[PDB]
Amino acid sequence: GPPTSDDIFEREYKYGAHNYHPLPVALERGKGIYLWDVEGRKYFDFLSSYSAVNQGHCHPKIVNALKSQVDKLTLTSRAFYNNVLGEYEEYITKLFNYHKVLPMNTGVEAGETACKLARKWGYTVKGIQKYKAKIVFAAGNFWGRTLSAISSSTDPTSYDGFGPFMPGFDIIPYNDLPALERALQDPNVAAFMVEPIQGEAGVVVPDPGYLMGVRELCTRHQVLFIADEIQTGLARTGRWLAVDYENVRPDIVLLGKALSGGLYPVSAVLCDDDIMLTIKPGEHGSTYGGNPLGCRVAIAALEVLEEENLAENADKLGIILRNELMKLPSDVVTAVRGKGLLNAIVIKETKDWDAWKVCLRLRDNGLLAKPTHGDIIRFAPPLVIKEDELRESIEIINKTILSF
Amino acid sequence: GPPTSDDIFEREYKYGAHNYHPLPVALERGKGIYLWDVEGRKYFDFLSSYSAVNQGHCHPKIVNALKSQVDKLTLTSRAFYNNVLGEYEEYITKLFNYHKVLPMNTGVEAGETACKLARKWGYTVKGIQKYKAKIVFAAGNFWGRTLSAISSSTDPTSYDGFGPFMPGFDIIPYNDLPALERALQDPNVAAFMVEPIQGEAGVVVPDPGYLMGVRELCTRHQVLFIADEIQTGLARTGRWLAVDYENVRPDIVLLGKALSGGLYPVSAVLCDDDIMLTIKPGEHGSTYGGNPLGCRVAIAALEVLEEENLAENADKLGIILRNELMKLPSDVVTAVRGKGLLNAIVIKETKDWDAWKVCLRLRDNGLLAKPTHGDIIRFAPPLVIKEDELRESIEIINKTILSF
Ligand SMILES: *C[C@H]1C[C@@H](C(=O)O)C=C1NCc1c(COP(=O)(O)O)cnc(C)c1O
Numbered sequence A, B: 001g002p003p004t005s006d007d008i009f010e011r012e013y014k015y016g017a018h019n020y021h022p023l024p025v026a027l028e029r030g031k032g033i034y035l036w037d038v039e040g041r042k043y044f045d046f047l048s049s050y051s052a053v054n055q056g057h058c059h060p061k062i063v064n065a066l067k068s069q070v071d072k073l074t075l076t077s078r079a080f081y082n083n084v085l086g087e088y089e090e091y092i093t094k095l096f097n098y099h100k101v102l103p104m105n106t107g108v109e110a111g112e113t114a115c116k117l118a119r120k121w122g123y124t125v126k127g128i129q130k131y132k133a134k135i136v137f138a139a140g141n142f143w144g145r146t147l148s149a150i151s152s153s154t155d156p157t158s159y160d161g162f163g164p165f166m167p168g169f170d171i172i173p174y175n176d177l178p179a180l181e182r183a184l185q186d187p188n189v190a191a192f193m194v195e196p197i198q199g200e201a202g203v204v205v206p207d208p209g210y211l212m213g214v215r216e217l218c219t220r221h222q223v224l225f226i227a228d229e230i231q232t233g234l235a236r237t238g239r240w241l242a243v244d245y246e247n248v249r250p251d252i253v254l255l256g257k258a259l260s261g262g263l264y265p266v267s268a269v270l271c272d273d274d275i276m277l278t279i280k281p282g283e284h285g286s287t288y289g290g291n292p293l294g295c296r297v298a299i300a301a302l303e304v305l306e307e308e309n310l311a312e313n314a315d316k317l318g319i320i321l322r323n324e325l326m327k328l329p330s331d332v333v334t335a336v337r338g339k340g341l342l343n344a345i346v347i348k349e350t351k352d353w354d355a356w357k358v359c360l361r362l363r364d365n366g367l368l369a370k371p372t373h374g375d376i377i378r379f380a381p382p383l384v385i386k387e388d389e390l391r392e393s394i395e396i397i398n399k400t401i402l403s404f
């Protein structure tokens, strides 16, 4: 017979690096909102691969785009032109109303590109002396595992044992306008990079007016507002961008994950000419960035998001989901938070009972969620879920919670 | 009507970042060693997407692997297990005879991972004081475009205007054993990272015995030998790894590009347990790293390399290519160098005539190659090329070179 779940666990333990401690479940099939393991058990996916499958697993239109393009051409490198990249660039720039896009593959590559753009713009446009440019980040931020990304982190597990760290990165508290103003008193600050909702920190939603104030402060002090929407963008929070909830237009928008529906690593950096063109030919890029296969996939994924009106569905069903989650008793769940279909709950962890055990029992009851910090549980199903499926999942959550 | 080549160029110029200056050709289809542009013209590919299509464009076995897997499951994230990753891990670790592999997406991510492993091993195993660990690089190195990667570069196009730079990186001349011996006197050096052949520097081949001397010196001074085989590995130079020419075993091996045949961004970090297991769960990773689709693709790409004996073909045909190129007069071609099918020529660049014009005329005569700097032209066709096709393309190169 084929491998069992424990066979798969043991094989990975033997031949793979131990850089993850995943939830004990071995998936082999995904379709829409559902996942199946090698034993044939069916699960609601309430993580959505950290929003990479906002469109559901293996969405047939994105799958068809990939299958169609793979027989024609997949990679020429950027040493030559392919016929697909410009179509995708026009589509996405007109969709988000920026002059230009720079394509990359992973989220952390988009963040590194944004840091390089901010620095080059600080030196060549703002007039900062080389190399004194600073980039400000918010405590609790997460945007990857490169040495640069962990150099801006306040999480010891990310940076411990990996120094020395990148200079020129400053950290202020999240959701703190006065701290940002104080930080931006320094004319050598080139940019402020921030998530409109901090996902990895436990779905931390800042107060109303925070993004508006960030925009005002960055514009006043000639500082680039970099909005990291790699997790929050593309309809997950109920809008094309979480930033849309306050009509805020960042200087640089970072997109990823759902940009491909999970079929290909695609990320994007969006900004206007005065920022984008500070990087001259030969000064940045990557081998797979902007390849025709990923571009076909991304066009199809964006089209799925727009056609099926997934942002509106996420807004409505997230209202329903948060309202049902708040019905849970306050001595088992202390906080419910989120926007759209990016939500989390906080349990009052005991020494006996924590979020990992709750997620194990949810797994046993047919729903897959991931815990965080030992007391946070994220609930983020694909945006193609319907109300009846959502209510079945909600009753599963209720039964599992109050079954302890 | 469909876009012409000029339409494609202009659309990318309007909506895409200007971080590249590609050779003016607009490809829409590729198969094996050949590419087709939107006008229908046919070209020999003599770049192979920087060795990412060692197997040729759209190799049917890799295409079939991708198409078969995309119907089942493409991404769960590493919060759960997928059934494919362990199969790939066992396969690649047995193939290259290392204990473990850490999967990533891009080559620069593999390099960042190796730097983090080297630092973590230096602090927790070698005993280096935090945070004094150093990594030594060779001048001319290229391993990507992150802030860290450009901090080790000696190419001003890579780093100028993007600082401040990552501390703890030292640079010595390439192909220089006395310099490495001097550098490794510092007990704070944790690793030496080097390409067996410097590709982006213009196919710089070190002298015989260099790699044996590197291995010897790294062992003598308890320093990790990191071999970047992202461009040189996987049959391109005539061996599974370029380091096989001297039969030395690096402590860490970096693989990428051809690892997927150009169908998916897949990279890998190979090392034994005493290095790999310094990274604990939660300290490194990536969202698309080790996803099932990329793993199926990589298995098929490695199997293609093995079954079609592409290393032997590269070894046999590369010497034919180099011997023919050396027959060009020294008035035009001043140097020929390479290993296997990774080759380059140096032309006697005047102010009237340079590598760019040679490549434009090569394009006009049906062969695609791109220059680095003003005098280097790489010749690296896919490893599935046959001898008669190679001699036809050699005729093209001869006619083009001598037509000036
Ligand atoms: C992809 C996902 C996985 C979780 C996790 O591992 O906990 C975090 C996600 N992405 C991190 C992230 C990035 C970097 O994305 P990568 O594709 O992994 O490089 C960028 N920006 C934000 C806001 C992120 O959360």
Ligand SMILES: *C[C@H]1C[C@@H](C(=O)O)C=C1NCc1c(COP(=O)(O)O)cnc(C)c1O
Pocket (backbone or CB within 6 Å): A077, A078, A285, A286, A287, A288, B049, B050, B106, B107, B108, B109, B111, B142, B143, B144, B145, B195, B199, B200, B228, B229, B230, B231, B232, B256, B257
């Ligand atoms: C892949 C490639 C194409 C050009 C270019 O894009 O400008 C140069 C490349 N070689 C990169 C390289 C890396 C980094 O790999 P990425 O996938 O681009 O991140 C690492 N190591 C070596 C030896 C490389 O040549």
